[PDB]
């Protein structure tokens, strides 16, 4: 099984250098080429650079102008962002191409990506608030509950329900960044009124925050 996995995305202040790593498994980097790409929130995909596993060939996008350095080890390829600016906030993906020497094609293997955030703010774990409806006179056999996950930095957080055992129809909305620099999102779930209570489990790896909120 051929796989790629990127790591090292984290929060940095502008100007603070950052190195991302793509770890390969099930094939040899020397037989292929490896390409870095990113996507800033709201913007499109953007090709950054390429390293050929078989040669001394390596190129950066014309616009890079020394903004990035790419290198390898025996099982990884790396991307260093030499002096990050807020514009480099993005998810970075690693991709394998065919053609080890000079000439590449067919980018058919991709990692899940790693998330880089460039900001002058300090990391901050989320506050978690239960969302329950006001409730009317005609009782329902079903109810929709939720959790508001507010004021965290950097993305991402994960939200589960009842430790993963409640998933049917869950809606977790895309995060939005407030003018504070912090992010918020909500997640809601519908369940029979008889099955309550229901607990949202929120985790924020960047601060190793884990919070459960039982919604009443």
């Amino acid at each position: 099984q051929e796989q790629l996995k990127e790591s090292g995305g984290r929060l940095v202040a502008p100007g603070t250098p950052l190195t991302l790593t793509c770890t390969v498994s099930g094939f040899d980097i020397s037989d292929y080429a490896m390409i870095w790409v990113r996507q800033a929130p709201g913007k499109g995909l953007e090709w950054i650079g390429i390293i050929y596993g078989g040669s001394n060939k390596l190129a950066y996008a014309k616009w890079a102008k020394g903004r990035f350095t790419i290198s390898r080890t025996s099982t990884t390829v790396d991307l260093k962002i030499t002096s990050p600016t807020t514009e480099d906030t993005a998810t970075y993906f690693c991709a394998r191409g065919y053609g080890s020497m000079d000439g590449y094609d067919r980018l058919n293997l991709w990692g899940q990506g790693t998330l880089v955030t460039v900001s002058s703010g300090q990391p901050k774990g989320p506050s978690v608030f239960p969302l329950a409806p006001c409730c009317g006179d005609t009782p329902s056999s079903t109810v929709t509950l939720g959790c508001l996950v507010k004021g965290y930095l950097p993305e991402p957080v994960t939200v589960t329900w009842n430790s993963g055992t409640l998933t049917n129809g869950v809606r977790t909305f895309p995060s939005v960044r407030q003018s504070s620099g912090l992010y918020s999102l909500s997640s809601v779930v519908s369940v029979t009124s008889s099955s309550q209570p229901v607990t949202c489990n929120v985790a924020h790896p960047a601060t190793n925050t884990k919070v459960d909120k039982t919604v009443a």
Binding site: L45, L107, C135, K150, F173, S186
Partner: protein
């Protein structure tokens, strides 16, 4: 400087129908055919659909086909499914790898059956009020086509403090869900009685309210 231009976003396609989008390069791609197409959904990596203009990627449905050469290329999706709702990117490859570049993307919106949303509203719990800032959350569930959201507080339209966030289309029924939040200070919040969220879908509106002090 090699520039790729794709069909303007969004493109609408009916379920079961055919849609063709295009990509035009300001100069010839390598060998006249180095042009790859990718599907991109939020939270997921790019997925190769077509490479070298017209070759179907392994394991990809033949409902996807690409054509073109030189500087103009198309991607055609037939038998369109809700699962196809995504942004599609072309990637032009040139003699010098340093010139390689993606187009700006074409978002394909898949047209299912229209459905009015059911709307929910969530007052702030006691613990949020104590922080001095509150968030009132309105949710529009399971709807199509797009909606607009209006907040009214004690009969007065709100113009600030609102943020909206929309899920991708459901891969089975093409519907969206939407979150709309109104943020206020705890004292502002305590100065009003009636909070209303209004979700409008053309000539249809769905309205949901609560009165602070009934919960």
């Amino acid at each position: 400087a090699a520039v790729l231009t794709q069909t303007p976003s969004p493109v609408s396609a009916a379920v079961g129908g055919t849609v063709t989008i295009s990509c035009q390069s300001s100069e010839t791609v390598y060998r006249g055919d180095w042009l790859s197409w990718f599907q991109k959904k939020p939270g997921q990596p790019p997925k190769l659909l077509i490479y070298d203009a017209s070759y179907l990627a392994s394991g990809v449905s033949s409902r996807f086909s690409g054509s073109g050469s030189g500087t103009h290329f198309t991607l055609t999706i037939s038998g369109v499914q809700c699962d196809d709702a995504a942004t599609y990117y072309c990637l032009g490859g040139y003699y010098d790898d340093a010139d390689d570049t993606f187009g700006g993307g074409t978002e394909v919106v898949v047209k299912g059956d229209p459905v009015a949303p059911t709307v929910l509203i969530f007052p702030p719990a006691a613990d949020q009020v104590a922080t001095g800032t509150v968030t009132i959350v309105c949710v529009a569930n399971k709807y199509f086509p797009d909606v607009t959201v209006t907040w009214e507080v004690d009969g007065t339209t709100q113009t600030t403090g609102i943020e909206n966030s929309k899920t991708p289309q459901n891969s089975a029924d093409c519907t969206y869900n939407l979150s709309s939040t109104l943020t206020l200070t705890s004292t502002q919040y305590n100065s009003h009685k009636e909070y209303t969220c209004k979700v409008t879908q053309g000539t249809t509106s769905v309205v949901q309210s609560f009165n602070r002090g009934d919960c």
